Copies of this chain bind each other. A is one copy, B any other.
């Protein structure tokens, strides 16, 4: 709700843009009643984890709408805010019990392939070096090759 709006203001602007807070487009997106209900559901219910806030630029106007679902719009610079806690509590940890995933303005196929190659497979490699994991790594390699083939 308000906590989710503050988290998206203090996180997505530092992720989607070069840094800052929720702009007029971002504030207007968060100001929608349905978007506010989606933010409240994400910050309260445990079922809703990923929270998407987009700083779009449609031919380069600053006018965006926030929603629970994530879609590949026209230059939609979405930012997936996956929450780990069941709720975003004001006293208990919320952002530490969450994460920020950056999505490209265009379709996320190439960025997702790069993330699988160098942020999912490398993370699994680091975890294994610190140590079903090899099966996960091989399946991630196969899925990254398939995603590259599909994007191409």
Instruction: Tell me the A residues contacting B by CB distance below 8 Å.
Output: 3, 6-7, 10-11, 14-16, 18-19, 49-50, 70, 72, 77, 79-80, 82, 84-85, 91-105, 108-109, 111-112, 114-116, 118-120, 122-124, 126-128, 130-137, 139-140, 142-143, 146-147, 150
Contacts and interface: CB of A to CB of B under 8 A. Distances in A.
Contacts of A143: 124, 127-128, 132-133, 135-136
B132 A127 contact: no
Contacts of A92: 18
B135 A119 contact: no
Contacts of A102: 93, 95-96, 99
Given A132-B143, A139-B136, A140-B124, A14 B95 contact: yes
Contact of A123 (B19, B101, B105, B142): B101
Q: What is the count of identical protomers in the complex?
A: 4
Nearest to A79: B96
Contacts of A130: 72, 108-109, 112
B124 A84 contact: no
Contacts of A11: 10-11, 14, 95
6 contacts: A10-B10, A84-B114, A93-B104, A112-B127, A127-B147, A134-B139
Contacts of A85: 104, 118
B18 A122 contact: no
A14 to B, nearest CB: 6
